[PDB]
Amino acid sequence: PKRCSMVLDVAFVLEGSDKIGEADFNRSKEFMEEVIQRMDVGQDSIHVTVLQYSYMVTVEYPFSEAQSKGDILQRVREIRYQGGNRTNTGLALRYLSDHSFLVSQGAREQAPALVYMVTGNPASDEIKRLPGDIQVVPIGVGPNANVQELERIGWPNAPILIQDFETLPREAPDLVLQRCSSGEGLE
Ligand code: NA
């Protein structure tokens, strides 16, 4: 099984809108749980922050809190589907650059920054250019993803396109960990 063991600050950003729905959001959670389980999460290795967004953005787990796999996974289990009426992807991205990845919020100065963002709908809001240092790998799930929007957000990273949320926990973890370890997408 593909492994990722390195000094890395990883963010998971999950769309939890009404358009996603509780059932598909739970599949996104299960995808995320599987990835964290496979990752070498620890104080001296991979660190994890988790965000959920729709109408607003919730920091479900900051970098500043205990970086053990057990503490992260248990908070993840506690995460509740918000079900908002918007897909404010631009706001979620602003959180990453202006809050999540700050040293004052637990991020490591020497660690590279990597974001896996699971979304199934076009952004409701304006998306602004992220600082190049924050690498975003968009995971566009389902027929309603705005692929060109995700390509622009992602560059240099190709979006990972998944047919549906049922396939997400089955297919995506392998691809996510390959990207984690190598630093680049496939082919
Ligand atoms: Na960082």
Curated annotation (Swiss-Prot):
Intrachain disulfide bonds: 180-181
Domain VWFA stretches: 9-176
Glycosylation sites: 26, 85
This protein's name: von Willebrand factor
Protein's organism: Homo sapiens (Human)
Segment of the intact protein contained: 1490 to 1674 of 2813
